[PDB]
């Protein structure tokens, strides 16, 4: 599934 | 984790086992429709010992109700808590083993072995590693004594490293039901002593004697008698499903008690068993559990232990115990009963701490005892059988199916060898 972006 | 495989054999094993799953479902809180109620952590924390999850959230007991007369298991359907067992967990019968050891064991029970050993090895292999077997079966009828011991021979010979357990009810010397008592008694025993791990006896007229005096009831039915036995069944495996300080495994109970392979026969008590007219007179304390349990008339088998001597025994307390008030007092009952305990074993008696009490009690105790007081009960089994056998009576129905004069004398001689071995150890 489309996963959340990791924190930059 | 641990699994116990239950098998009900005979008319008595079905009724006793029906009240076993009555009381076990009361301990863990299972509504008879299959669901759980009780919202406690430790009720179902160790639930796999007596139950299997069935992908419906219900807990099917790991029991196989099994007989040859369909009526006595059809009444389990009509009675309460008949819905928990699986329909596949029932081995049907059509002819009905009519109180004949020859008919139950050799001829008619042979074609039902292929269905009951198929279902017991299916439920055994369904888990990871089995712990032990447990049965309830009778020694007075034919479908329990003859065809129940059929299952004992195969299950031991295909799971040798495991253990097994019996709740065997014996014929009575005082009250006489089922005129073919001593044939079923002797034929079950000599096979039992070579394929059973530990066997523990129950007597009918000791159960009536308890319900007359200590329980003080006028006229209840057999449901009360099965309630005492289900209290002992709940006790002897309480620690297999509940924690404790000084735990107890079923084979821990075996190693700690059985000296010698030939003698593995035990006597069972349970305390407290007091009338409700004396519940206000009874302030429940650890010492009065112990003196009640060391009372010859409390016993569930009517063999008097004052005549014999205890060899070794184990007491299993349940609940919240001040355990030093348990075990130095468990010394203290050894010291006054110096003539009731054998001399060559220091610390004849064992203590156990099950940390969970039964229903409606803060604390209870379950007694198991390897004693030489069984030899008198086996002595009038010898006297009954010899009277049956003096001039060839009652047994041509056995020999009409393939019995021999050669093997009945081996049933007599093996069991007289056993009462001999109790006699020297006194």
């Amino acid at each position: 599934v489309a996963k959340p972006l990791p924190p930059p | 984790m641990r699994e116990i495989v239950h098998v009900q054999g005979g008319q008595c094993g079905n009724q006793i086992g029906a009240k076993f799953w009555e009381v076990i479902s009361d301990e863990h809180g299972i509504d008879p429709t299959g669901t759980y109620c009780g919202d406690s952590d430790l009720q179902l924390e160790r639930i796999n010992v007596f139950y299997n999850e069935a992908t419906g959230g219900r807990f099917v007991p790991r029991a196989i109700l099994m007989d040859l007369e369909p009526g006595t298991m059809d009444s389990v359907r009509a009675g309460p808590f008949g819905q928990l067992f699986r329909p596949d967990n029932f081995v049907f019968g059509q002819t009905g083993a009519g109180n004949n050891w020859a008919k139950g064991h050799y001829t008619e029970g042979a074609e039902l072995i292929d269905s009951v050993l198929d279902v017991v090895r299916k439920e055994a292999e369904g888990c990871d590693c089995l712990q032990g077997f447990q049965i309830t079966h009778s020694l007075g009828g034919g479908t329990g004594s003859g065809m129940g011991t059929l299952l004992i021979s195969k299950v031991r010979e295909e799971y040798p490293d495991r253990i097994m357990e019996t709740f065997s009810v014996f014929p009575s010397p005082k009250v006489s039901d089922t005129v073919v008592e001593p044939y079923n008694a002797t034929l079950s025993v000599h096979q039992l002593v070579e394929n059973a791990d530990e066997v523990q006896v129950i007597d009918n007229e000791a159960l009536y004697d308890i319900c007359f005096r200590t329980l003080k009831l006028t006229t209840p039915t057999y449901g009360d008698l099965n309630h005492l036995v289900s209290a002992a069944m709940s006790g002897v495996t309480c620690c297999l499903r509940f924690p404790g300080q000084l735990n107890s495994d079923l084979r821990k109970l075996a190693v700690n008690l059985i000296p010698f392979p030939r003698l593995h026969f035990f006597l069972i008590g349970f305390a407290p068993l007091t009338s409700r007219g004396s519940q206000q007179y009874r302030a429940l304390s650890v010492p009065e559990l112990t003196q009640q349990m060391f009372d010859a008339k409390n016993m569930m088998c009517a063999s008097d232990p004052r005549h014999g001597r205890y060899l070794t025994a184990s007491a299993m307390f349940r609940g919240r115990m001040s355990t030093k008030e348990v075990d130095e007092q468990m010394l203290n009952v050894q010291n006054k009963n110096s003539s009731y305990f054998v001399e060559w074993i220091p610390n004849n008696m064992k203590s156990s701490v099950c940390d969970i009490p039964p229903k409606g009690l803060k604390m209870s105790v379950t007694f198991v005892g390897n004693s030489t007081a069984i030899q008198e009960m086996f002595k009038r089994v010898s006297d009954q059988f010899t009277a049956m056998f003096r001039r060839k009576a009652f047994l041509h129905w056995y020999t009409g199916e393939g019995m021999d004069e050669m093997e009945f004398t081996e049933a007599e001689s093996n069991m007289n060898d056993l009462v001999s071995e109790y006699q020297q150890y006194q």
């Binding site: 959340p4 | 669901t35 759980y36 952590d41 999850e53 959230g57």
Partner: protein, 201 residues
């Protein structure tokens, strides 16, 4: 947009964020529609969360917590077996710390009023009540059902009742607890509940 696009939460999300993006648009180089990272929500209103003794608890209590929605049913025999195990894990993590650590919002699929009362008198944690339509919109938002009653919008059946699931700040799926799932690992899956990246900021 997470975990699904077709839910009553995300359709109200993509509505509410959009006219206030219009409010900044006519007041003013803004872009329409606003991004998923730019949308923000209130998940639980003022009068939604109710504690054990039935008094209002504010949403503001939920900072620094690992909050999880526990889909459940009193009559469901899966739920009756997983209920004391969740009671054990909730207990041992609260007083296993100087500050209360994990938290479960009880969201239910009971038959009627008296069914929830029998399933609430034994619950220590917070709960949401049935007649509030927050329960109905949350179960479609997390794709949770017993069987197919209401038509899902091209979706499958993610969980079966029960399934306790840790949630995010903006309703995102944090990390899955497979009680009955593709893993189907029952009665122990509460051990997978970490409390480090699953913080309700």
């Amino acid at each position: 947009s997470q975990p699904v696009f077709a839910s009553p939460l995300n359709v109200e999300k993509r509505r509410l964020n959009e006219e206030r993006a219009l409010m900044q648009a006519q007041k003013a180089n803004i872009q329409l529609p606003p991004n998923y990272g730019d949308m923000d929500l209130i998940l639980f209103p003022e009068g939604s969360l109710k504690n054990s003794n039935n008094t209002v608890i504010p949403q503001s209590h939920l900072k620094g917590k690992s909050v999880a929605l526990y889909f459940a049913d009193g009559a469901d025999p899966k739920c009756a077996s997983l209920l004391p195990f969740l009671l054990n894990y909730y207990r041992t993590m609260n007083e296993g710390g100087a500050n209360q650590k994990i938290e479960i919002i009880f969201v239910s699929l009971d038959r009627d009023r008296e069914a929830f009362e029998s399933h609430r008198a034994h619950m220590p944690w917070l709960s949401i009540d049935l007649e509030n339509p927050l329960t109905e919109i949350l179960k479609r938002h997390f794709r949770v059902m017993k069987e197919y009653e209401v038509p899902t919008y091209g979706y499958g059946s993610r969980t079966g009742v029960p399934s306790v699931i840790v949630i995010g700040s903006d309703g995102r799926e944090a990390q899955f607890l497979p009680i009955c799932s593709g893993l189907e690992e029952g009665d122990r899956a509460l051990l997978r509940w970490d409390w480090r990246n699953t913080k309700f900021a």
